[PDB]
Design a protein around this ligand. Structure first.
Ligand SMILES: [Zn+2]
Length: 258
């Protein structure tokens, strides 16, 4: 008995166990494209994933994660609004039960079918556990997914989901190149936020890309076949594992771009 996305343990209930849920820098938020401010000071993002080493894929009962070896600066994120080097540790998605919902961040109230999160931690802090306790500990790259043409680079992930259908299941997932999940343009918004799942720490510097990638209906459909439950329990489809937009409060969203 803990947190989830159901009617009795969903986002609206999280504050009881995680008071920070009502904090000053919570995520996600709605990106109001007309109030975001263009900042000429923002540098272009620098994504260096050529030496990435994926290790395993697992279904943690809330989403599925693809874990990477973060023992060295193999896959890092630099530049943009960041000061230092951030190592990629894992990526996961949030998606809906229908193509009209699923993303966590919204753009002018527009919801996308899903949202990809590539989580990186600031190397100055030694390890992920220490980084989450700092205001500039994490830097999460958010990418929107819209339904249209298939994304070749995503098929490898889609094909292994059958092996990790239920909570607790994990499978070897080596030699996966995350570069196949990036859009053509790296233009971004950025704002200070938090992790959108418990424990909801406000240690994130969010970097949400303007350009969505397209995925086919067939690809997203396979996401919807996963289970929140563990093997041997009543089947509950893993859909709508997204948190609604939170109050922006005293924060400003900056844009790299036009
Ligand atoms: Zn996420």
């Amino acid at each position: 008995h803990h947190w989830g996305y159901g009617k009795h343990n969903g986002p609206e209930h999280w504050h009881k166990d995680f008071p920070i849920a009502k904090g000053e820098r919570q995520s996600p938020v709605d990106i109001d494209t007309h109030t975001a401010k263009y900042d000429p000071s923002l540098k272009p993002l620098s994504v260096s994933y050529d030496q990435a080493t994926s290790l395993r894929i697992l279904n943690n009962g809330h989403a599925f994660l693809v874990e990477f070896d973060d023992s060295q600066d193999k896959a890092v994120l630099k530049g943009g609004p960041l000061d230092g080097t951030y190592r990629l540790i894992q990526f996961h998605f949030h998606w809906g039960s229908l193509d009209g919902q699923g993303s966590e961040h919204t753009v002018d109230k527009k919801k996308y079918a899903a949202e990809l999160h590539l989580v990186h931690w600031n190397t100055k802090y030694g390890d992920f556990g220490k980084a989450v306790q700092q205001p500039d500990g994490l830097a999460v790259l958010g990418i929107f997914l819209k339904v249209g043409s298939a994304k070749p680079g995503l098929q490898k992930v889609v094909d292994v989901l059958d092996s990790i259908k239920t909570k607790g299941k994990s499978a070897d997932f080596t030699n996966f190149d995350p570069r196949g999940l990036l859009p053509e343009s790296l233009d971004y918004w950025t704002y200070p936020g938090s992790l959108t799942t418990p424990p909801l720490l406000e240690c994130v510097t969010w970097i949400v890309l303007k350009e969505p990638i397209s995925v086919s209906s067939e690809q997203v459909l396979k996401f919807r076949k996963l289970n929140f439950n563990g093997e041997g329990e009543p089947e509950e489809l893993m859909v709508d594992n997204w948190r609604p937009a939170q109050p922006l409060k005293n924060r400003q969203i900056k844009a790299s771009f036009k």
